[PDB]
DNA sequence: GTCCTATCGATCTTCGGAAGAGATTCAGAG
DNA sequence: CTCTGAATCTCTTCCCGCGCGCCGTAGGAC
């Protein structure tokens, strides 16, 4: 099985998982550790923002790849924002900071 | 939004109202027939956002032309529907409600703040009893909870001069009444009022909480929820299923319950329901909010199915299925796939074959990017269609796109970094992924149906990073040790072993060949045999010291196979490497030497050529295996027939009563073991002897070409323990309880095993399988703990400038050395000027890396101890200096600045975790060091040291031997005698501990009475007895306080004094003693007064890293001086340690059953052992120093791997140790603003003391505290990493009340927020950002 | 094609800085593509960059030199355009 | 039959997990 | 009379991918 682009999950916009569904392989925590074992940071940033989570970014990446530019704009993984809402639904005010 | 920090704190109710866009009132979402969202519900359109993409619900506007306007037919605002997933609402509770988290954390934060027990606060909150507030002129305290009968009393005893509320309202009034700062000042002065250390510690916790609440902007009532925000609906969809039904949503139902209960409460309060009813409704509402928040912390979780409890918000936050480990740290990625792998031997080391279909389905956009660029397709609409058409031109497009684009291959489970690698792909017709043979070792990839995944790197930097860091050819050395990961495969080594072997008489023997090429031609013409002995003119190149090859040619006596192989070895090596029958060991070093000399680029091609030649000539070998090849030595039947008979004799003794039960067992099993050894030796000898050949005359034997023998000897598969079971005897077995079977499995698999033998074998087989299945999980858990404790460390500076370090010596234990010095010290930098053996002459500079040449130079000298810099001792704040870490084991040079050492070390420790188990010898010179003995009747050292250990400078002046001569041992071989191996060095009583005197003189039972302190035993064996001393437990104070003493007496009133010593020869007796030298007996020096008679694999390291205290704590003595007893053992004994200049009464309670290494007058020091058994890493650090605890940890964690044969570089452990003691506890607050006694991060305390001493003010004094990994991971100052690990429901409150702020330093936090990690190329970017600032 | 990158690593004394420099050069050669300083072999810009580095004709300093000079040329054309605009208005 | 409100608001939720550590209660005595 | 020991309670933790298969609010009132 192999997946380029297809269905995306609703609560978090990560791609679906499975064969009967047009899903992609899960990049587990052990794989993240192995990538960090090398100095690969751009690889990780792509793998966890553009390929999977940042909805606006993964389209601008698609356009650049078709255009032959091969440059990504990571933005921010939507799942993290979901987490923030999930914590903000409690009595916790967690927020980003400028400085 | 761009950000640089994350701040967590309590949310004020008006802040919640600021979050909200509306107040949800009706607990309905959508109609059950129409799919429109009901207004003022959980899915209200005007509250959270419109459902339609860009249209309002009422349909008044369906265009961007009306974007941002407000309709008045339904009330929904028209904009992008995505905002619907961001807007929140809020429910205004009809009455206050306590936040469940803050009520029932590990401590009770609300309880701690009010200093009110959790049981009582819970009793109040659930409306069980009143609590008096503003008690005024009443005998009712500040809180003073009171029951309903008590309230009924107060209702008439007093009027309204008291107020007694119920539930959270009373707690809110208490919170609203908290004069926090004045309270903290009072408690911090009351702290000095008492020393109750069973209360001072919790008082420090309470004041710390008060200070944290004072400093933060948080206010007490914020612990009580008043407005509960609702999650945006798009995060909790009511998705439909097959048919007109919508899938059940847990949070939606929890919110529905809460809304219904609260609306009922409002209705009643409007209609003035009686107090009892409203109290019950308020209790139900509080419990429903509890179920919404942290369902399960209630008495019982609610469910809407077959007892499947509903997941709450806190359930969605934490857990293995929670967001943190399910969606943030690891997320599914597009442009990836998986397939079943297969071996393609034709591939180069840097290539991999992928199916055409997978390539087309992964590189689709790149193909579009060519169809437009080629102009062959109009746009995407036609490009996708053409790709679907699988046009023959599309394959030319794919063959052009895929030309130089790496693909990542990732078998899972990827324990170590070598499990993910980049490969240049090549199209293959089939559907399996073609993998290279030499790489499969790194993946641990057996091709018996093993799936593997591919990921396509898209951006430019990703491609470059794959080619530069993750390429197969860039990972030829293992990062865990100086070991190649391209170690030749099982089949290839068999081929080389078969090719280079030599036979006595063979075709084409003895001639002269003019060169390797002519040899090869001869073989291919069939005129010569491969194993034929021949003389070929060989030519070799050796690069000089400067680096230019020098050609030398000679005639060489060798074999045809070796001459053929020499055509592949590169032009830099000596012929002596190929002039031997190569095996999995001998070849490996060969390859390593190539990497040592030629370089990476020659090495990779040499490895590929070795693989090719090995495969070809192994195919030519045709080394089949058959039943004819398993040989049973003919003598075996006799070896059985005798050995069993011997057991019969051991049985006959048992048949005669001449032996005990156990002795029969331990004689039979030993005889069977000896028989098994004899059978195995005869079988091996026959296997090697089975070949004898005629060399032109007279038969001569030689090494055997038996298939099994070549498989075993080449090291491919099937070692001695396998061939022994296949051709010797299966041998003994063990029961599930571990007992050795008295009747071994006398058969071997070539012969048939009978039914009982097989049933016996099943015990071991299933035990091993279950061991594997259970240990495969604990290994992974250990890996996770290691990565989450060490994720932070990165080499972020070149030189720290420190000069300390740790001294490396060869491991000498159990006599002979178990590992050399070179292994320890290779690849580190010197701590200070290495010196020449002798005096006043240095040998190596003070900060030079000890690479291979300097390691050889040191081994050339007699240097045993070398101090080298270590990662633990580096003085770099929030990072590690490069010089301490030293060599990058995967590169050979010093480690670059920016590498994430922490994850590498964690993987290095955790990779072999599935290999563990979850269930005088040579002549030398005598070097007693640590000697604290005296002299006896021979003077052979009256061993008075619980330390003395004699070492052994070898014939090369090298300590190759040493151990601990126990107290009371007699040193036969002492004072530096030279003694040969096997000649008794010293003697000991293996059963009892003897006590000995120093002087020779008369004695009396001083202050001893028969019956009171000794028992008049008879010694029924003879009738003449040695008196038995009464214990402290077998006698009361009339015998406990009458402690036995055997003080030596003389006519002068004092004993012969040692110069400068006034101590009389006072000696005593402990319990269980047996003493013969009674009153009137002359005891000589060295005479024994009396005698007193008396582990794991993976867990042994898992508990070591967690720093668990031992079940049997070997008590180490502290400070110094001479020990004493206090009062005797009642409940548990009490002792005292006296230093004249020191705590003369350093007291300490002691267990009774633990025998003591000191009795009443033994000189003691900090760390001195009072009892045997394992020590405590915490105590070791506190008493012997950081270097000492580091050495203990490294050696005791290496003794587990050395036993199991796993080799891991010692440095990989020290990094973890650096993480364990990253915290320090303040001793004196000093001029620092730190608390009097507090645990602060050691980096912060060190930097503060640095600037303070720079200004000349009193720097803080601290003790570095050893925290176990499981806790040190959660103890960090960055709450995101801790909360991502475990106990999130606790950390997310503890940090909340503290008003914590995260700087996002570290790898895990940056991975969560989706930015570049502060390591590698990310470190380069961050460093550029900080330098350009 | 490149099987190893050891020579460039010896040139740019860091495994990581080589990645970033090659990223800079290959990005230049790809979008607004400057022609490379090495004969092509139908390669992707990535490998061509790693070809140029091994020839020792591209690094951080050289790229910064080129960038600064290119910026100066772009500012120089600005002065001529501003002056010509000022002359034409009179 | 469809459409509504609500949870064993006259039970018994499973005993066949280890363990590891804090927290919370209780002794022998100063 | 309550101070340091233990002693008993609750809370939390347990490798990782793949691939199916099925199953998925309830009772009673208008
Ligand atoms: Zn509308
Ligand atoms: Zn350092």
Q: Which of B622, B738, B594, B741 is nearest to B676 (CA)?
A: B741
Nearest-neighbour CA in chain C from A29: distance (Å): 23
Alpha helix stretches (DSSP H) within B480-634 = 490-500, 516-525, 560-565, 584-597, 600-621
Rounded to 5 degrees, φ, ψ at B270 are -75, -35
Angle in degrees, CA B1303, B1306, B1310, rounded to 5: 75
B433 three-state secondary structure: strand
- Following CA atoms B44, B46, B51, B53 in sequence, which dihedral angle do they give, to the nearest 10 degrees? -170
**CA-wise closest residue to B866 among B874, B855, B877:** B855
Query: Domain for residue A81, yes or no?
Result: yes
Task: Write the residue in B461, B463, B896 that is nearest to C14 by C-beta.
Answer: B896
- Helix/strand/coil for B1118: coil
Q: Interior CA angle at B974 toward B973 and B976, to 5°?
A: 115
Closest residue of C to A67, CA-based? C31
Ligand found nearest the CA of B885: 2
b (16+ CB within 10 A) / e for B339-353: bebbbbbebbbbbbb
Alpha carbon distance B1174, B996 (integer Å): 27
Distance B535 CA to ligand 2 centre (A): 56
In A3-42, the residues whose Cβ lies within 8 Å of chain B are 3-6, 10-12, 14-17, 23-42
Q: Are residues B653 and B741 in the same domain?
A: yes
For A37, which of B369, B412, B900 is closest by C-beta distance? B900
Q: Which domains does chain C have, with CATH numbers?
A: 1-89 (3.90.940.10)
On whether any CB of chain C is under 8 Å from the CB of B23, the answer is: no
Owner of token pair 């193909």: B367
Q: Whole-angstrom Cα distance, residue B171 to residue B130? A: 11
**Alpha-carbon gap, residue B50 to B53, rounded angstroms:** 8
- The span from the CA of B291 to the CA of B1057, in Å, is 80
Residue B1068, domain extent: 994-1093
Experimental determination technique: cryo-EM
**Domain range holding A36?**
14-99
Q: How far apart are CA B339 and CA B362, in angstroms?
A: 13
In whole angstroms, give the CA distance from residue B812 to residue B963.
9
Does B888 count as an annotated binding residue? no
User: CB-based contacts of B389: which residues, under 8 Å, 6+ apart?
Assistant: none
Q: Is residue A57 part of a domain?
A: yes
Q: Phi/psi class of residue B1011: alpha, beta or left (left: φ > 0; alpha: ψ in -120 to 50)?
A: left
Q: Are B670 and B639 members of one domain?
A: yes
Q: How far apart are CA B1213 and CA B1223, in angstroms?
A: 18
Extract the runs of DSSP E, i.e. beta strands, from A34-83: none
Could you tell me if A96 and A83 are in contact, meaning their C-beta atoms sit under 8 angstroms apart?
Answer: no
Is-contact B713 B691, C-beta < 8 A?
Answer: no
Q: Cβ contacts of residue B744 below 8 Å, gap of 6+?
A: B672, B676, B729, B730, B731, B732, B733
Q: Judge contact between B1272 and B1281, C-beta under 8 A.
A: no
Q: Give the separation between CA B418 and CA B476, rounded to whole angstroms.
A: 10
Which bases of strand D have any atom within 7 Å of the beta carbon of a protein residue? 3-4, 6-7, 9, 13-14, 20-25, 28-29
Rounded to the nearest 5°, which phi and psi values hold at A15? -65, 155
Nucleic acid strand E: bases within 7 A of protein CB: 2-5, 11-20, 24-25
SS3 B37: strand
- Which two three-digit tokens encode residue B1180? 């070791």
Contact B232, B87 (CB under 8 A): yes
Is B688 found in the same domain as B668?
Answer: yes
Domain membership of residue A65 (yes or no) is yes
Cα of C90 to nearest chain B Cα, Å: 45
- Residue B1134 CB in 7 A reach of strand E: no
The CA distance from B294 to B515, in Å, is: 82
d(C-alpha B1301, C-alpha B1313), whole Å = 15
Give chain A's domain count. 1
Using the C1' atom of nucleotide D6, identify the protein residue whose alpha carbon is closest. B257
Residue A90 covered by a domain: yes
Say yes or no: B683 and B642 in one domain. yes
Backbone angles phi, psi at B60, to 5 degrees: -65, -30
Between CA B207 and CA B186 the distance in angstroms is 10
Q: Is residue B971 domain-shared with residue B1056, that is, in the same domain?
A: no
Nearest to B474 by CA among B445, B439, B444: B439
Task: Give how far Cα B237 sits from Cα of B41, B43, B243, B302, Å.
Answer: 14, 9, 17, 21
Task: Name B1014's bridge partners.
Answer: B1010, B1029
Q: What is the dihedral of CA B1181, B1184, B1187, B1189, to 10 degrees?
A: -40
CA distances from B1184 to B143, B870, B1141, B1180 (A): 49, 18, 20, 6
Q: After which residues are there C–N gaps above 2.5 Å in chain A?
A: none
- Give how far C87 is from chain B: nearest CA, Å: 41
Contact C30 A39 (CB under 8 A): no
Do both B975 and B1033 map to the same domain? no
Which one of C1, C5, C25 makes the best mutation probe of the B interface by having the most chain B beta carbons within 10 Å? C5
What 3-state class would DSSP assign to B1163? strand
Burial class of residue B608, CB neighbours in 10 A (0-12, 13-18, 19+):
buried
Ligand nearest, relative to CA of residue B70: 1
Instruction: Determine, for residues A69 and C30 on separate chains, whether the beta-carbon distance falls below 8 Å.
Output: yes
Q: Which residues of B spanning 79-108 put their CB closer than 7 angstroms to strand E?
A: 104, 106
**Where do we find the tokens 């234990």?**
B813
Indicate whether B665 and B646 sit together in one domain: yes
Helix (H, G, I), strand (E, B) or coil at B1310: helix
**Is A7 inside any structural domain?**
no
Please give the Cα distance from B53 to B62 (Å, whole number): 9
Please choose, from the candidates B1030, B1022, B1006, B997, the residue with its C-alpha nearest in 3D space to the C-alpha of residue B1161. B997
* Measured distance CA(B879)–CA(B882) in Å, rounded: 10
Query: Six-digit token pair at B617?
Result: 């000539």
CA dihedral B1167, B1168, B1171, B1173 (to 10 degrees): 50
Give the closest residue to B334 by CA, choosing from A57, C45, C19.
Answer: A57
B446 among annotated binding-site residues:
yes
Helix (H) or strand (E) holding C60: helix C60-89
Residues B937, B1032, single domain; the answer is no
Report the gap between the CA of B559 and the closest CA in chain C (Å): 34
Is there a single domain that holds both residue B657 and residue B723? yes
Which secondary structure element, helix H or strand E, spans residue B149, and what is its range?
helix B148-157
Tokens (6 digits) for B1127: 């009062």
Q: For residue A5, is it within any domain?
A: no
Cβ atoms within 10 Å of B538's Cβ, excluding its own: 21
Q: Do A70 and C15 touch (CB under 8 A)?
A: no
Residue B887 CA neighbour count, 13 Å, CB half: 27
**A66 is near strand E: CB distance < 7 Å:** no
Please tell me whether residues B971 and B1004 are part of one structural domain.
no
B1068 and B1022 in one domain? yes
Q: CA torsion sign, B80 to B82 to B85 to B87?
A: negative
A28, part of any domain: yes
CA dist B1146 and B663 (Å) reads 49
């Amino acid at each position: 099985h192999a997946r380029s682009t297809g269905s995306y999950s609703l609560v978090t916009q990560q791609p679906l998982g499975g064969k009967a569904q047009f899903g992609g392989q899960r990049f587990g925590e052990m794989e993240v550790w192995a990538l960090e074992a090398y100095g690969a940071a751009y690889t990780l940033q792509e793998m966890l923002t553009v390929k999977s989570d940042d909805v606006n970014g993964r389209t601008k990446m698609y356009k650049n790849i078709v255009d032959g530019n091969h440059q990504m704009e990571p933005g921010m993984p939507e799942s993290f924002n979901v987490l923030l809402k999930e914590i903000r639904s409690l009595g916790i005010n967690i927020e980003l900071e400028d400085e | 939004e761009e950000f640089d920090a994350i701040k967590i704190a309590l949310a004020s109710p008006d802040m919640i109202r600021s979050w909200s866009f509306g107040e949800v009132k009706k607990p309905e979402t959508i109609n059950y027939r129409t799919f429109k969202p009901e207004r003022d519900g959980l899915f209200c359109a005007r509250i959270f956002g419109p459902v339609k993409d860009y249209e309002c619900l009422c349909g008044k506007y369906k265009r961007l032309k009306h974007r941002g306007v407000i309709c008045e037919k339904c009330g929904v605002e028209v904009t992008q529907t995505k905002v619907r997933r961001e807007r929140m609402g809020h429910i205004e509770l009809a009455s206050p409600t306590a936040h469940i988290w803050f009520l029932k954390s590990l401590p009770s934060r609300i309880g701690l703040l009010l200093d009110m027990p959790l049981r009582d606060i819970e009793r109040v909150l659930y409306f069980e009893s009143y609590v008096v507030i503003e008690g005024g002129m009443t005998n009712l305290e500040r809180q003073q909870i009171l029951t309903e009968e008590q309230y009924l009393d107060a209702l008439e005893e007093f009027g309204d001069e008291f107020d007694a509320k119920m539930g959270a309202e009373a707690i809110q009034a208490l919170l609203k009444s908290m004069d926090l700062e004045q309270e903290c000042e009072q408690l911090r002065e009351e702290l000095n009022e008492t020393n109750s250390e069973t209360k001072r510690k919790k008082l420090t916790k309470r004041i710390k909480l008060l200070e944290a609440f004072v400093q933060s902007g948080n206010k007490p009532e914020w612990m009580i929820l008043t407005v509960l925000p609702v999650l945006p609906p798009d995060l909790r969809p009511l998705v439909p299923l097959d048919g007109g039904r919508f899938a059940t949503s847990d949070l939606n139902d929890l919110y529905r319950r809460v809304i219904n209960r609260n609306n009922r409460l409002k209705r009643l309060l409007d209609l003035a329901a009686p107090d009892i009813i409203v109290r019950n409704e308020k209790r139900m509402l509080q419990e429903a909010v509890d179920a919404l928040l942290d369902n399960g912390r209630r008495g019982r979780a609610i469910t809407g199915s077959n007892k499947r409890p509903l997941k709450s918000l806190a359930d969605m936050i934490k857990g293995k299925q929670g967001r943190f480990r399910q969606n943030l740290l690891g997320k599914r990625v597009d442009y990836s796939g998986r397939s079943v792998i297969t071996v393609g031997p034709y591939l180069r080391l840097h290539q991999c074959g992928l199916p055409k279909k997978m390539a087309l389905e992964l590189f689709k956009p790149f193909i579009y990017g060519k169809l437009e660029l080629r102009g062959l397709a109009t746009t995407i609409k036609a490009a996708k269609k053409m790709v679907e058409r699988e046009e023959a031109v599309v394959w030319d497009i794919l063959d052009e796109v895929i030309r130089e684009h790496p693909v990542l291959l990732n078998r899972a489970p990827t324990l170590h970094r070598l499990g993910i690698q980049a490969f240049e792909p090549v199209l293959i017709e089939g559907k399996a992924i073609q993998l290279h043979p030499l790489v499969c070792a790194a993946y641990n990839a057996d091709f018996d149906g093993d799936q593997m995944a591919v990921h396509v790197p898209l951006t430019l930097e990703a491609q470059l990073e794959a080619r530069a860091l993750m390429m197969s050819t860039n990972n030829i050395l293992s990062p865990a040790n100086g070991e190649p990961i391209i170690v030749p495969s099982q089949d290839v080594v068999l081929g080389l072993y078969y090719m280079t072997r030599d036979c006595v008489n063979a075709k084409g023997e003895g001639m002269v060949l003019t060169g390797p090429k002519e040899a090869e031609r001869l073989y291919r013409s069939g005129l010569a045999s491969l194993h034929a002995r021949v003389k070929v003119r060989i030519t070799e190149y050796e690069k000089d010291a400067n680096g230019e090859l020098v050609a030398k040619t000679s005639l060489k006596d060798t074999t045809v196979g070796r001459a053929i192989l020499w055509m592949i070895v590169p032009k830099g090596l000596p012929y002596s490497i190929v002039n031997q029958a190569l095996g999995k060991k001998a070849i490996s070093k060969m390859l390593n030497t190539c990497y040592r000399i030629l370089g990476l680029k020659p090495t990779v091609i040499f490895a590929d050529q070795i693989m090719y030649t090995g495969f070809a000539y192994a195919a030519r070998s045709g080394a089949s295996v058959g039943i004819d090849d398993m040989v049973i030595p003919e003598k075996k039947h006799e070896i059985i027939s005798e050995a069993e008979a011997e057991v019969a004799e051991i049985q006959e003794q048992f048949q005669s009563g001449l032996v005990t039960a156990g002795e029969r067992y331990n004689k039979v099993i030993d005889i069977w073991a000896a028989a098994n050894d004899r059978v195995s030796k005869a079988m091996m000898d026959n296997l090697q002897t089975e070949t004898v050949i005629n060399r032109d005359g007279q038969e001569e034997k030689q090494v055997s070409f038996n298939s099994i023998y070549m498989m075993a000897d080449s090291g491919a598969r099937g070692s001695a323990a396998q061939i022994r079971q296949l051709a010797g005897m299966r041998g003994l077995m063990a029961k599930p309880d571990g007992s050795i079977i008295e009747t071994p499995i006398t058969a071997n698999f070539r012969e048939g095993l009978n039914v009982l033998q097989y049933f016996i074998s099943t015990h071991g087989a299933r035990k091993g399988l279950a061991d594997t299945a259970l240990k495969t999980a604990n290994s992974g858990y250990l890996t996770r703990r290691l990565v989450d404790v060490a994720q932070d460390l990165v080499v972020t500076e070149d030189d720290c400038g420190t000069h300390e370090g740790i001294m490396m010596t060869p491991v000498i234990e159990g006599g002979d050395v178990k590992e050399p010095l070179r292994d320890r010290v290779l690849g580190r930098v010197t701590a200070e000027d290495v010196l020449k053996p002798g005096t006043a002459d240095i040998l190596v500079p003070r900060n030079t890396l000890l690479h291979e040449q300097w390691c050889d130079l040191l081994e050339e000298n007699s240097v045993d101890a070398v101090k080298v810099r270590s990662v633990v001792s580096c003085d770099t704040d929030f990072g590690v200096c490069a010089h301490c870490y030293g060599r990058d084991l995967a590169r050979g040079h010093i480690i670059n600045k920016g590498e994430a050492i922490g994850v590498i070390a964690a993987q290095s420790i955790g990779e072999p975790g599935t290999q563990l188990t979850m269930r005088v010898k040579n002549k030398g010179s005598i070097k007693l060091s640590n000697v604290k003995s005296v002299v006896n009747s021979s003077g052979k050292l009256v061993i008075t040291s619980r330390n003395t250990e004699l070492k052994l400078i070898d014939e090369f002046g090298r300590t190759k031997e040493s151990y601990k001569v126990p107290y009371g041992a007699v040193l036969a071989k002492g004072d530096g005698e030279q003694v040969a191996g096997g000649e008794t060095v010293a003697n000991w009583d293996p059963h009892t501990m003897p006590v000995i005197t120093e002087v020779s003189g008369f004695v009396r039972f001083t202050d001893m009475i028969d019956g009171q302190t000794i028992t008049r035993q008879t010694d029924e064996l003879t009738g003449l007895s040695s008196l038995v001393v009464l214990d402290s437990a077998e006698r009361t104070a009339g015998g406990k306080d009458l402690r036995p003493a055997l003080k030596i007496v003389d006519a002068q009133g004092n004993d012969v004094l040692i110069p400068g010593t006034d101590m009389p020869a006072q000696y005593f007796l402990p319990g269980k003693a047996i003493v013969q030298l009674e009153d009137g007996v002359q005891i000589s020096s060295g005479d024994t007064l009396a005698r007193i008679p008396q582990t794991g694999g993976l867990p042994r390291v898992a508990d070591l890293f967690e720093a668990r205290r031992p079940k049997e704590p070997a008590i180490l003595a502290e400070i110094s001086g001479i020990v004493s007893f206090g009062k005797e053992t009642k409940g548990k004994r009490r002792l005292v340690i006296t230093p004249v200049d020191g705590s003369d009464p350093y007291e300490e309670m002691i267990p009774k059953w633990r025998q003591l290494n000191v009795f009443e007058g033994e000189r003691v020091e900090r760390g001195d052992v009072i009892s045997d058994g394992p020590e405590a890493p915490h105590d070791i650090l506190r008493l012997r120093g950081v270097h000492a605890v580091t050495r203990y940890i490294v050696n005791e964690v290496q003794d587990v791997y050395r036993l199991q044969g796993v080799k891991i570089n010692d440095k990989h452990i020290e990094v973890i140790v650096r993480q364990m003691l990253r915290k320090a506890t303040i001793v004196n607050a000093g001029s620092s603003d730190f608390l009097e006694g507090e645990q602060v991060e050691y980096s912060r305390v060190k930097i503060a003391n640095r600037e303070l001493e720079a200004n000349g003010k009193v720097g803080a004094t601290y003790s570095r505290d050893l925290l176990g990994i499981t806790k040190a991971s959660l103890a960090t100052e960055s709450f995101i990493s801790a909360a991502s690990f475990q106990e999130t429901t606790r950390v997310l409150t503890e940090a909340a009340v503290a008003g914590k702020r995260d700087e996002l330093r570290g790898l895990k936090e940056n991975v969560i927020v989706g930015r570049l990690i502060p390591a590698g190329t990310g470190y380069a970017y961050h460093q550029d950002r900080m330098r350009r600032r | 094609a490149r099987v190893t990158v050891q020579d460039a690593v010896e040139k740019i004394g860091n495994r990581f800085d080589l990645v970033l420099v090659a990223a800079r050069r290959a990005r230049q050669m790809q979008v607004g593509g400057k022609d490379p300083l090495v004969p092509e072999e139908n390669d992707k810009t990535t490998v061509i960059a790693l070809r140029e580095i091994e020839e020792g004709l591209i690094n951080n300093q050289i790229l910064d030199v080129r960038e600064r000079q290119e910026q100066q040329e772009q500012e120089a054309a600005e002065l001529q355009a501003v002056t010509a605009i000022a002359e034409g208005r009179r």
